[PDB]
Amino acid sequence: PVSMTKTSVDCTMYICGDSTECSNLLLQYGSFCTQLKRALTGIAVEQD
Amino acid sequence: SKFGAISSVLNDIFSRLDPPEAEVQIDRLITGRLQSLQTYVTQQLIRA
Amino acid sequence: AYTNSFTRGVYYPDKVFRSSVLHSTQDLFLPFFSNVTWFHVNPVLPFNDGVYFASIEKSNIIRGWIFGTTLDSKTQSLLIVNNATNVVIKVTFEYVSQKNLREFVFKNIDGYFKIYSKHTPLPQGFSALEPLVDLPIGINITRFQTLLAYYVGYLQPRTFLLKYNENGTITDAVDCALDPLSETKCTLKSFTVEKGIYQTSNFRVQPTESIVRFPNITNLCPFDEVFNATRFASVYAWNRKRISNCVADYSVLFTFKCYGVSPTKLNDLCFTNVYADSFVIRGFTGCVIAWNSNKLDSYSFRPTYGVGHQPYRVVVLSFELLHAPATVCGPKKSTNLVKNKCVNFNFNGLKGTGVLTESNKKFLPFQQFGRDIADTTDAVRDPQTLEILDITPCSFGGVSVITPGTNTSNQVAVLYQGVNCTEVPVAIHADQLTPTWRVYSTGSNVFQTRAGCLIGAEYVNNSYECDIPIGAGICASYQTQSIIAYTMSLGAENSVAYSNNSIAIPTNFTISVTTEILPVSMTKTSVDCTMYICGDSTECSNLLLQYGSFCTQLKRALTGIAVEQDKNTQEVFAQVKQIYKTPPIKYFGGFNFSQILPDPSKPSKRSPIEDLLFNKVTLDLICAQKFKGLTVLPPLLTDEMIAQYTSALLAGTITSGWTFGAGPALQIPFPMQMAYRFNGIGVTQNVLYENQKLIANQFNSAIGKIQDSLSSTPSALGKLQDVVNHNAQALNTLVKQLSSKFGAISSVLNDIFSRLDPPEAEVQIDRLITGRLQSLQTYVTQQLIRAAEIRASANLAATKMSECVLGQSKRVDFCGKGYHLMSFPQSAPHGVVFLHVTYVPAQEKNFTTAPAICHDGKAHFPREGVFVSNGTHWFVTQRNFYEPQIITTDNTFVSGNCDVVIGIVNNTVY
Amino acid sequence: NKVTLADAGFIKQYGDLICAQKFKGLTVLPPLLTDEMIA
Amino acid sequence: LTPTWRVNVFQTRAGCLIGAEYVNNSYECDIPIGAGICASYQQSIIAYTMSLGAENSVAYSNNSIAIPTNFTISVTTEIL
Amino acid sequence: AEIRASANLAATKMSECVLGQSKRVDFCGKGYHLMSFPQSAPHGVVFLHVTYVPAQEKNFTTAPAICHDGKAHFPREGVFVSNGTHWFVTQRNFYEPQIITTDNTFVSGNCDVVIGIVNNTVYD
Ligand SMILES: *[C@@H]1O[C@H](CO)[C@@H](O)[C@H](O)[C@H]1NC(C)=O
Ligand SMILES: *[C@@H]1O[C@H](CO)[C@@H](O)[C@H](O)[C@H]1NC(C)=O
Ligand SMILES: *[C@@H]1O[C@H](CO)[C@@H](O)[C@H](O)[C@H]1NC(C)=O
Ligand SMILES: *[C@@H]1O[C@H](CO)[C@@H](O)[C@H](O)[C@H]1NC(C)=O
Ligand SMILES: *[C@@H]1O[C@H](CO)[C@@H](O)[C@H](O)[C@H]1NC(C)=O
Ligand SMILES: *[C@@H]1O[C@H](CO)[C@@H](O)[C@H](O)[C@H]1NC(C)=O
Ligand SMILES: *[C@@H]1O[C@H](CO)[C@@H](O)[C@H](O)[C@H]1NC(C)=O
Ligand SMILES: *[C@@H]1O[C@H](CO)[C@@H](O)[C@H](O)[C@H]1NC(C)=O
Ligand SMILES: *[C@@H]1O[C@H](CO)[C@@H](O)[C@H](O)[C@H]1NC(C)=O
Ligand SMILES: *[C@@H]1O[C@H](CO)[C@@H](O)[C@H](O)[C@H]1NC(C)=O
Ligand SMILES: *[C@@H]1O[C@H](CO)[C@@H](O)[C@H](O)[C@H]1NC(C)=O
Ligand SMILES: *[C@@H]1O[C@H](CO)[C@@H](O)[C@H](O)[C@H]1NC(C)=O
Ligand SMILES: *[C@@H]1O[C@H](CO)[C@@H](O)[C@H](O)[C@H]1NC(C)=O
Ligand SMILES: *[C@@H]1O[C@H](CO)[C@@H](O)[C@H](O)[C@H]1NC(C)=O
């Protein structure tokens, strides 16, 4: 094996799909979604 | 999964409960789903 | 008349002092480059959501304003005038208090009229407005008028990134929703963007309208026959009534509690199995309604009994909210059914947003809903027309921004990922395209890729090296003037002239010195768990002592990582038993090692190249981290010690070759060691000797270029800088996570403890503690993974030190591109740099070749070479350097006759 | 022909398992190098 | 102070070391302290700058070579 | 994952140190690797690396080439050494001086280019 599937996650869509109140609440959790996006982007670049 | 909440649907929680208890239930759901995302990303990092 | 607002109307969002920070604020602002209306000296302009008001005058024509809804006597209105002595405000409320550009901001939220202002000696500068006053006028304002060049702009809720000066002044701002570049700047929390492609946000089509679909029933439920019953049953023989096919209006309904539902919401939900149980006592999802029935009723209730023993009538309402077809629910007006359009929908309490279409699913009569693999609603039976509708979320997707870097240009391209250009969101209003900015199609600037639709770059038929990867073979770059997209080129095509009997032999060579950078260790970090989580709050510490050995595990893991870092450094650099020193006279047959050898003049005793490497890697933010309990432990080996180890390795290899790595160091002249290494790559020794000076010069040239190749290229030391940046970013993220509330009422523990009773303060503090503990655990897990990666890099660096520095390697590409001659280590802040000296053949020439030569009827094969020819005579030569020689019995061996070797060629063997 | 990919991360036009995952916010990004380029 | 106990005072980049006497001699690292400082038990606890090994100078010249006249068969152990 | 890396390294050493003789420096013990023997251990492996360590080094005077009859001679598979008066050719890793003959050297060019060439007799 050389590479694996490059995955992207829409954090807001997964956690709070279509619920605007849930996204407003999620805004108070800091940079969790940003950190997850950074990690997944690093993995994706590493595959290439 | 419900993670100890009344339901796994955010809209049902927001439509059935006042904000004081909706906060507890939505906190449980959001924490569970953030944990699921974090677990997925950690295992993706190890697999990568 | 209209004009450009430019970057004006920024005000201080709060009363907090900040300095030397980038702060994101979501507030009512004036968007950058807004079309502000311009009046010249007046009409009653609307007061939509707040107003920015500028005035360029020197005669005080403008005095004040009137605010109200109708500006008549029937509705209450506000009035503000600035007299030459004082400013008078009247509404039930009165208030009095104290070219030139006067800028003002007026807002009306929660019964508060807030006024900010600034004075300046529309201009094209940046100025931040300071607050003036909040007034509790308590009236809704929809219109206003100026009381006699003045400019009016309207505020909207925007997200802004404000930059605070060193003395706390807002000097710059970014309007996150202005355009893709500003969204990228807000995502990165920076004012400068480097070249690349950045995932900024997701576009989401917004719901056009809202629809409600409830059953057609209109009869009222028999609640009166339950609650207003003449006589209630007994608690043992409790009465039960079923409620079906009616409209339960709970407003008609003392103690009224509910389990699993809120009393203020029952009018909106649809219920399946409603049963009312009534009985009398003395003082599961559903509701309990109890009320004193003293004046209405064995207990043997009597009027002289107390409240604790007075009769109470009790009704229990039990219903199932596990959807299924709804027979009873409250007063809700159904709208029309909107299809093929993103709408907010409500089907008997099932709320959502999306597009509703005709469904081909073969439901069954009892089936009211359909679910997908994730147990989420996917099809719905319309309560009135009984038709099956598919629910699909309306269009959304990811957006990436391609920038050549803000240091070069402000032009950007936008990639809509996983979307064809025919489905790209094309909206003429702000009811779509969540980023809310627009990049319009101009024909040749819209391209389709298997990665999505790219807008803002023209696709050229040329092919270049990849500059910014888009995906699926497509890259983008700044042409210079515009952004171009293209198919990446894999390299220059080349055809090798193969034939039956043609061989290419090099006639010359190049001595190449190449660089390989390897991380060896990362920053050793320690965390004070209590100080991070609690930070001077003793009550928090006492609460934290009940979460077990979490901090003990984290301390153990971080200590293991810290020990592993020193182990990595030792395994890489501490390979030599002895500390070898170079001889006083630095003559090595013309080879010049001054760039890699230590310099006595420098206090650190580093080489010029090592000094360059330590200058090129950047190893109050530290104090801010320290105050939160995050510290950096010093490495065991100092930089001086690592440089001493490197000097010992270099002296050993220079003065003894590869012998000191396999035993006692055996001195050998450097040209003789170089001859050994030339022998190691299948080149005869004389080739080195007869070219000694030239070879030396080439090396002296190549090493001379190394400095430039590290001091001219921007990201030459990218890997070590990446290690440093990863550590700094992780610690900064840990620090910034302390401002998160995690659902609590504040992020400050001492604020929660000083304003709440312990029963609820415990809940809030538990939320904060769990959030911070999760942050610490995530940090430690990422540290463990990064430590594993760094350990792999350090093991590789130790292997390179053993096999490239302590010996000559025959492994292809392990110690440089060409044929490995030798290698030199140089210490770098968090790692090692190998200078690989390799032999690259050059200046090849064609020759005719044969497998063997027939002579006296015997087949002759070359001993240590290959047969070549000018075209008339036949020589034998070594394979990596053209040195033709007369074919004799001494450089040839005999095997068989010239009857089986295909390609054998007649010649003479002297 | 012997390895069956799941997504390959190419364009999905509005109109099975991949669709559900996408609706939950999970998407696959295409590799930079195509199969033809690697060949 | 939080530890509530009290305790030959030395300053290092790793912090304040109490209870160890800094000596000018250099030995192989026994207990790593940090930034080149190690500790050891001499009757007393000593702190010192760790040594990297014995200094050695190879007698290099442009016409001299050292050639072994004997050998030793070494058997070493590697545990994985 | 760490143990898997260790086990992959152990398998590589079993292949390259036990099933063959390795030229990789310090991969199969310190010194010039001769062979290796595996021994099982509770949760791992123990390699006994047998290596050749040179010892009892002696100083000699050396030359890149020997000039004879106007011809430059380079050692075929050795190095030129000298007691101080006579000149021998020896293998690099063990002192075995040999008479400099035309059968253990090879000729390349005159005595005008090689720096450090030394006059001596190349017996035929
Ligand atoms: C901030 O104000 C101080 C106060 O005098 C001044 O010295 C400093 O230069 C200012 N910082 C700037 C202008 O960046
Ligand atoms: C009971 O009767 C009173 C007066 O007739 C009325 O106001 C009230 O709404 C009734 N209660 C119910 C549950 O119908
Ligand atoms: C996007 O839709 C158009 C219109 O049907 C179609 O021609 C095009 O092929 C689609 N995109 C892709 C990548 O197939
Ligand atoms: C040599 O190569 C040519 C093509 O370049 C081919 O036609 C010929 O058959 C080859 N030689 C032999 C002996 O087949
Ligand atoms: C080999 O290349 C060098 C340049 O590196 C040049 O000076 C020299 O003349 C070349 N030798 C031959 C024989 O072409
Ligand atoms: C070695 O190179 C440096 C830098 O090019 C130069 O200053 C120095 O004189 C050189 N040494 C000799 C002996 O030529
Ligand atoms: C060798 O021959 C091929 C074609 O036969 C030619 O393309 C190439 O340039 C030649 N090489 C040299 C060094 O002349
Ligand atoms: C044959 O090779 C020699 C090199 O020794 C050269 O002088 C001569 O010109 C070559 N003959 C032809 C025909 O190229
Ligand atoms: C080489 O010489 C022999 C001598 O008998 C002859 O038989 C053979 O045909 C020759 N080969 C070619 C290719 O002419
Ligand atoms: C050879 O070494 C000696 C002593 O180490 C030195 O005096 C001499 O200059 C060196 N040879 C050259 C050409 O510099
Ligand atoms: C070589 O060393 C061995 C000891 O390992 C010794 O017995 C022997 O005499 C030595 N031989 C020579 C020639 O020094
Ligand atoms: C070789 O000579 C140098 C200097 O004369 C000396 O220091 C060294 O010990 C000698 N080596 C041996 C093995 O005697
Ligand atoms: C020179 O070598 C010969 C061996 O043939 C012998 O005379 C002696 O070992 C050497 N001379 C000296 C002075 O060591
Ligand atoms: C070696 O011999 C040549 C000619 O026979 C002579 O020019 C040269 O000086 C001799 N070398 C020494 C070191 O005497």
PDB file of all heavy atoms in Angstrom, chain C residues 125 240 688:
ATOM      1  N   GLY C 125      -8.796  56.032   5.161  1.00  0.00           N
ATOM      2  CA  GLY C 125      -8.002  55.577   6.278  1.00  0.00           C
ATOM      3  C   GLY C 125      -8.794  54.655   7.190  1.00  0.00           C
ATOM      4  O   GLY C 125      -9.928  54.267   6.898  1.00  0.00           O
ATOM      5  N   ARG C 240     -59.312   5.908  33.624  1.00  0.00           N
ATOM      6  CA  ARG C 240     -58.526   6.111  32.415  1.00  0.00           C
ATOM      7  C   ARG C 240     -59.437   6.408  31.234  1.00  0.00           C
ATOM      8  O   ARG C 240     -60.439   5.718  31.021  1.00  0.00           O
ATOM      9  CB  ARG C 240     -57.651   4.893  32.096  1.00  0.00           C
ATOM     10  CG  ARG C 240     -56.982   4.960  30.729  1.00  0.00           C
ATOM     11  CD  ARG C 240     -55.794   4.016  30.627  1.00  0.00           C
ATOM     12  NE  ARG C 240     -54.531   4.699  30.886  1.00  0.00           N
ATOM     13  CZ  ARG C 240     -53.350   4.099  30.938  1.00  0.00           C
ATOM     14  NH1 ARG C 240     -53.231   2.794  30.760  1.00  0.00           N
ATOM     15  NH2 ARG C 240     -52.263   4.826  31.175  1.00  0.00           N
ATOM     16  N   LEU C 688      40.878   8.784 -10.051  1.00  0.00           N
ATOM     17  CA  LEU C 688      40.938   9.830  -9.039  1.00  0.00           C
ATOM     18  C   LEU C 688      42.281  10.549  -9.063  1.00  0.00           C
ATOM     19  O   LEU C 688      42.332  11.777  -9.180  1.00  0.00           O
ATOM     20  CB  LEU C 688      40.667   9.248  -7.655  1.00  0.00           C
ATOM     21  CG  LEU C 688      40.672  10.342  -6.591  1.00  0.00           C
ATOM     22  CD1 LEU C 688      39.330  10.415  -5.913  1.00  0.00           C
ATOM     23  CD2 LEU C 688      41.786  10.099  -5.585  1.00  0.00           C
TER      24      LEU C 688
END
